[PDB]
Amino acid sequence: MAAEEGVVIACHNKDEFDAQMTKAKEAGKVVIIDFTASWCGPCRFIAPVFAEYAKKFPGAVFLKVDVDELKEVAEKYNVEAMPTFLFIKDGAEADKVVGARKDDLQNTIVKHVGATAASASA
Numbered sequence: 001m002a003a004e005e006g007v008v009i010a011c012h013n014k015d016e017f018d019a020q021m022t023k024a025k026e027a028g029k030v031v032i033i034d035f036t037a038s039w040c041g042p043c044r045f046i047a048p049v050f051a052e053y054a055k056k057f058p059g060a061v062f063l064k065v066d067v068d069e070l071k072e073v074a075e076k077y078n079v080e081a082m083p084t085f086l087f088i089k090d091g092a093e094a095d096k097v098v099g100a101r102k103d104d105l106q107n108t109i110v111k112h113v114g115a116t117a118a119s120a121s122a
């Protein structure tokens with residue numbers, strides 16, 4: 001029983017997806033949407049990483065959606081079909097990553113939510 005806690009949300013009807021995408025522009029935090037075709041992939045190995053990360057980074061809203069029921073969202077950002085951790089800084093598009101990289105995720109959230117990016121500079 002999680003009834004959607006303070007972790008990486010899991011929208012599944014747009015309405016929910018917005019509940020976050022909107023809590024970033026006004027809230028003053030970066031956005032992190034975790035798309036997905038249908039299988040996703042690991043959805044277990046990095047499971048305790050995403051959700052746990054959403055909270056670890058209070059400078060973001062975090063959220064996961066399915067590009068099979070509301071793809072309309074992924075089609076706007078151009079994801080195609082995958083666990084793309086598409087981002088929406090300022091309410092547009094800062095960049096994307098993927099829900100299968102434990103070295104590319106926390107690395108992107110730091111550049112958008114971390115405002116420091118603990119991974120090289122130039």
